[PDB]
Amino acid sequence: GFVCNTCPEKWINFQRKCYYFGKGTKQWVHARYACDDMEGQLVSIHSPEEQDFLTKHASHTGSWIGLRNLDLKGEFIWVDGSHVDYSNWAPGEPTARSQGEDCVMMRGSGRWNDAFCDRKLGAWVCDRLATCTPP
């Protein structure tokens, strides 16, 4: 057996992961470190079910997530190194011609927009793996 749904206080479980819905005005790199210093990382998203869960708890005024154009060539990848095997980009996003808009945020609808990394948003989402109880 082995059930993996234990999360630290203040975190919320969904499937095998734990999620922290942070509040407080931050630009992307600041949110990146807030997550890191809590033993998590800016969230990566891998299914409709996981997106649906995030949308349910998402801040209405937008949140930083863990997707960024790290290689500076137009390919948006997860900072946690996980596979890009799902997307919820808003229609037309990411824009082909938007130099500098390398960071990614999630709107209240849950759909993703690129953004200048120094934009200030009032929310940001972290994740980490849940720990497990022995059967």
Author numbering: 157 to 291
What did the study's authors say about this model?
The second principal receptor for IgE, CD23, is a type II transmembrane glycoprotein with a C-type lectin-like domain (CTLD)4 (3, 4). In its membrane-bound form, CD23 consists of three CTLD “heads” connected to the membrane via a trimeric α-helical coiled-coil “stalk”. The interaction between CD23 and IgE is critical in the regulation of IgE synthesis, which can be up- or down-regulated depending on the oligomerization state of CD23 (2, 9, 10). We have determined the crystal structures of the human lectin-like head domain of CD23 in its Ca2+-free and Ca2+-bound forms, as well as the crystal structure of the Ca2+-bound head domain of CD23 in complex with a subfragment of IgE-Fc consisting of the dimer of Cϵ3 and Cϵ4 domains (Fcϵ3-4).
The S252A auxiliary binding site mutant crystallized in the same conditions and same crystal form as wild-type Ca2+-free derCD23. Similarly, Pro-250 is trans in two copies and cis in the others. As predicted from the crystal structure, the introduction of the S252A mutation did not affect Ca2+ binding, but unexpectedly, the D258A mutant was unable to bind Ca2+ even though the aspartate forms part of the apparently nonfunctioning auxiliary Ca2+-binding site. Ca2+ binding to the mutant derCD23 molecules (E249A and D270A, principal; S252A and D258A, auxiliary) was consistent with binding only to the principal site, with the exception of D258A, which showed no Ca2+ binding.
